[PDB]
Amino acid sequence: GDLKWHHHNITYWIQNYSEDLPRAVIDDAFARAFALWSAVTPLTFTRVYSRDADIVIQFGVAEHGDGYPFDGKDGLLAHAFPPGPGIQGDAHFDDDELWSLGKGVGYSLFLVAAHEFGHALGLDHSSVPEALMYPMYRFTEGPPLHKDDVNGIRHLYG
Numbered sequence: 001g002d003l004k005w006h007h008h009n010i011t012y013w014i015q016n017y018s019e020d021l022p023r024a025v026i027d028d029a030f031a032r033a034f035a036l037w038s039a040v041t042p043l044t045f046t047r048v049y050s051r052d053a054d055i056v057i058q059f060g061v062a063e064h065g066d067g068y069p070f071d072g073k074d075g076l077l078a079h080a081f082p083p084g085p086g087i088q089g090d091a092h093f094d095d096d097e098l099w100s101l102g103k104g105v106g107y108s109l110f111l112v113a114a115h116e117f118g119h120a121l122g123l124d125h126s127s128v129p130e131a132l133m134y135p136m137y138r139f140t141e142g143p144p145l146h147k148d149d150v151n152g153i154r155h156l157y158g
C-alpha cells in the first residue's frame, strides 16, 4: 500500500491567491510549510509555474472544480489528495475562511498548509492529539512536527 511519491524533486505551483494576505506572505507560508517536510524526508520542493506540477495549490470556495465542494465559513478548512497523478497530490484551501498567520482571528495558513502538505506526501490523520496530522486545528507558536508525524513520514520515505 503506502501511497508515496516515487521521485524526489517535487514541484509545486501556486495556481491562485487569497486576498486575505499579501502575495509574498502566502508564498512564504507555503515555502515554510514545505521546509518542514523537506528536513525530514529525501524530498526537495521546487516552486514552478506550470500546470504539470506535482502539488498544485488552490484557493477556492464551494464547488471549485474537483467535485469536492467547500462549505462556506466554518466546517472544512482545506483538503489535499495523497501522492499520484493529476488531482492527486494537490492542496486546496477554503477561501470562505479567514486566512492569517498571527495569534488571533482566522486560521494560520502556515499551520493548515503544513497539515495539508502532510496529506499530499501520503500521511493520513494521526490518533496522537499533539500531532500535526491530528484532525484538529489549533494555533501554536511551537514547532509543529511531533514524533508521530516524523515516524509516519519515515514509514513512507525511509
Ligand SMILES: COc1ccc(-c2ccc(S(=O)(=O)N(OC(C)C)[C@H](CCN3C(=O)c4ccccc4C3=O)C(=O)NO)cc2)cc1
Binding pocket: 075, 076, 077, 078, 079, 080, 081, 082, 111, 112, 115, 116, 119, 123, 124, 125, 131, 132, 133, 134, 135, 136, 137, 138
Ligand atoms: C496542528 O495543526 C493543524 C492544522 C490544521 C489541521 C486541520 C486541517 C483541516 C481540517 S478540515 O476540517 O478541513 N477536514 O478535517 C476534518 C473533517 C477532520 C479535512 C477533511 C478532508 N480530508 C480528510 O479527511 C483526509 C484524510 C486523509 C488525507 C487527506 C484528507 C483530507 O483532505 C482535512 O482533514 N484536511 O486536511 C481539520 C484540521 C490539523 C492540525
Ligand SMILES: [Ca+2]
Binding pocket: 070, 071, 072, 073, 074, 075, 076, 077, 094, 096, 097
Ligand atoms: Ca469552510
Ligand SMILES: [Ca+2]
Binding pocket: 053, 054, 055, 056, 084, 085, 086, 087, 088, 089, 090
Ligand atoms: Ca497533482
Ligand SMILES: [Ca+2]
Binding pocket: 018, 020, 094, 095, 096, 097, 098, 099
Ligand atoms: Ca478568505
Ligand SMILES: [Zn+2]
Binding pocket: 060, 064, 066, 068, 079, 092
Ligand atoms: Zn478541492
Ligand SMILES: [Zn+2]
Binding pocket: 115, 119, 125, 135
Ligand atoms: Zn487533514
